[PDB]
Amino acid sequence: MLTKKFKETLKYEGSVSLTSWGAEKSPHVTGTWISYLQLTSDERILAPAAGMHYLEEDIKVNDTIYLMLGVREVEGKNGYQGIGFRVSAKAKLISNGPEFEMMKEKYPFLRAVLELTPVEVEQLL
Template identity: 40%
Template sequence: MTEDERILIPAGIMRRTEENVNINNKVKMAFGSKNVIGYNDYKGTAFVVEGKARFFDSGAEFDMMKGKFSFVTRVFRNNSYNG
């Protein structure tokens, strides 16, 4: 996640998702983590994030992700919003 609350996901495949985002860029994603204490002190919880998304294959953010993940051909970016 970036400082301005954008989520960047390295995309090596995700072709069908990219096709869908090109038609309708509103997305809802669920993320899970076992490192966060959940309901009734269970280990793990999930988060749902809504926003608008796009794929891109150039620019500073792409270069940064490519440096971390050599398989990246595109980056999936979600701009979170409430509602």
């Protein structure tokens, strides 16, 4: 599901966009940092949730989000310097357990872990 190139991107830094929708007429966009993402052995993507109020209300209605990220330092299609990804994922927020404990240690500011289950990965460059 998560290619070698996707995994390579996660070694750099950049803005991650999280698009959610369903609780209001318009969608919401929430950010995180590539360096805050943690890959699990079953290739779930975890991020520290500090605020993410709107995204939480959206995913109570529609648990599908879009993640977008891109870095200049990874070679895209046709040697193009730069790569981007659009990931469709199912979202839930985790408030306890060993992964929460592991993330709470790295990111003391978090109230919950955002757990993303990738359902589709599109490499865009």
